[PDB]
Design a protein around this nucleic acid. Structure first.
Ligand code: ADP
Ligand code: ALF
Ligand code: MG
Length: 439
DNA sequence: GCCAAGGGGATTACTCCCTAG
DNA sequence: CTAGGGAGTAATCCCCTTGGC
């Protein structure tokens, strides 16, 4: 391993470094599709550290990541390779306008004496600042959570496709997503000459370009997830709403509006129309009634717990209930500013006092480590099993020591069931499409 | 002057059904 | 007669104008 590293790569990660090095030295690009929590970051960083250590390329190295991952990757690269001067390219336009003063355009290869070596950037900024970005030449590009790039009609695909870069990685734990075209977009991006626009063939052609190990094999020290399915019925208020709403199917089947209204009442009828008493507010949502009994048991267990919502208005209502109860919580959603994210995550991870993290599906589902929680609760299931898997794999990562449990509140006899059954069967489709070897 | 808010808008996600190849 | 791409909607996040001390 490159001597720049602070902490030793594990056996499978060293094999992963070797694959990434061979991809580079053979002049080709590939996807590190290693499962969640296997340590894609240390392998990818060790590539950059090898380009530095072996070929004296001290960048310019680009990291693109989701906004909640940015502080995590800045910290971890500082941990694993302190020699790399990070440029944390995020901020307001005026703050970014100052940070551009560190971009040396004269050197196409930076040396250790350089204003920066690794630049870490949001998927948002490579698009908004694209006009600045495409005027620079990158010696290696890493893309975290490459499922962000899965749509070829997305501006972030079109923009990053056109970046002048020698070699590129896609990092993901969930490559397949919804369709073969979404897989192609990841394959075209890495190797545009080969993949310009049956499973026996697929697993043969992709073998050089994707590497994927799984926790069942390499990380079996961590116990399996305990998934639990927690059915509850529509309380009398909810079914009065749901049935009078379903009466619109005397005309329809607007249906795409109705399925969002049906999801709202399955979360809490106050989302549809607010009432009043907090005792009624608990019992007039069946999910919240079953959750209250569950949190009551989990607290006596000492089970620090992550609650995932598909709605923002629900995570508001949720902390009204958490302030009616005695429960100490913290919160993270797509509106919390990035320094607020860093501090809340670090706060939760530091002090065991906090019981609940009210955590968003998307903004709270990727990149970050939450190993001091042990329980994950989906208040809402999601249409994409990869997203719910990403959310639940925030615990159950290489730092975990407690057993992990995953609960899922499903309102029986509602579209909450169709959503979960449709998302669940896609996991089998995605598993079948990964029937071949990933090694 | 300095911080706050939020509010607006463009991008991205994913189902459902129209319409044309 | 199938598929493509438009309609709906809500989360995500940068910009920026208003307001207060
Ligand atoms: N060789 C290693 N030594 C120590 N810690 C590691 C190693 N590899 C991974 N980790 C730890 O694994 C945790 C999660 O890994 P990470 O790479 O963030 O997962 P992902 O593959 O989703 O990015 C991190 O806290 C990181 O410190
Ligand atoms: F694949 Al990750 F945090 F980067 F689960
Ligand atoms: Mg990662």
């Amino acid at each position: 391993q490159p001597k720049l590293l602070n902490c030793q790569l594990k056996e499978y990660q060293l094999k992963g470094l070797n694959w990434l090095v061979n991809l580079y030295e053979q002049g080709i690009n590939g996807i590190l599709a290693d499962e969640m929590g296997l340590g894609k970051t240390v392998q990818s960083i060790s590539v950059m550290a090898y380009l530095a250590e072996r070929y004296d390329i001290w960048g310019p190295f680009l990291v693109v990541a989701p906004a909640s991952t940015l502080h995590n990757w800045q910290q971890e690269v500082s941990k694993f390779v302190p020699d790399f001067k990070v440029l944390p390219y995020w901020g307001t336009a005026a703050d970014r306008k100052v940070l551009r003063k560190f971009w040396d355009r004269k050197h196409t290869t930076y040396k250790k004496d350089s204003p920066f070596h690794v630049m870490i950037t949001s998927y948002q900024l490579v698009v908004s600042d694209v006009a600045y970005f495409q005027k620079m030449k990158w010696q290696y590009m890493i893309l975290d959570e490459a499922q962000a790039i899965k749509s070829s009609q997305s501006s972030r695909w079109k923009c990053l496709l056109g970046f002048h870069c020698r070699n590129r990685l896609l990092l993901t734990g969930t490559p397949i997503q919804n369709n073969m075209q979404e897989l192609w977009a990841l394959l075209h991006f890495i190797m545009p000459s080969l993949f310009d626009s049956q499973l026996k063939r697929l697993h043969m052609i992709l073998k050089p370009f994707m590497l994927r190990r799984v926790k069942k094999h390499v990380q079996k020290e961590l116990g399996d997830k305990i998934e639990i399915d927690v059915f509850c019925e529509l309380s009398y208020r909810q079914r009065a709403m749901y049935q009078s709403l379903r009466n619109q199917i005397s005309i329809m089947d607007t249906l795409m509006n109705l399925v969002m209204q049906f999801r709202k009442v399955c979360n809490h009828p106050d989302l549809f129309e607010r009432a009043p008493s907090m005792a009624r507010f608990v019992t007039d949502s069946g999910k919240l009634a079953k959750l209250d009994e569950l949190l009551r048991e989990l607290k006596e267990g000492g089970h620090r717990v992550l609650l995932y919502f598909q709605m923002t208005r629900m995570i508001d209502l949720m902390e009204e209930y958490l302030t009616y109860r005695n429960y100490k919580y913290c919160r993270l959603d797509g509106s919390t500013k990035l320094e607020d994210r860093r501090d809340t995550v670090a706060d939760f991870q530091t002090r065991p006092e906090i019981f609940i993290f009210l955590l968003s599906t998307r903004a709270g589902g990727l990149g970050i480590n939450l190993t001091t929680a042990d329980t994950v609760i989906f208040y809402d299931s999601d249409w994409n099993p990869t997203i719910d898997s990403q959310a639940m794999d925030r615990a159950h990562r290489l730092g975990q020591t407690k057993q992990v449990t995953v609960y899922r509140l499903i309102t029986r006899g509602t579209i909450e069931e169709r959503i979960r059954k449709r998302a669940l069967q896609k996991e089998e489709v995605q598993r079948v499409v990964i029937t071949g070897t990933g090694s």
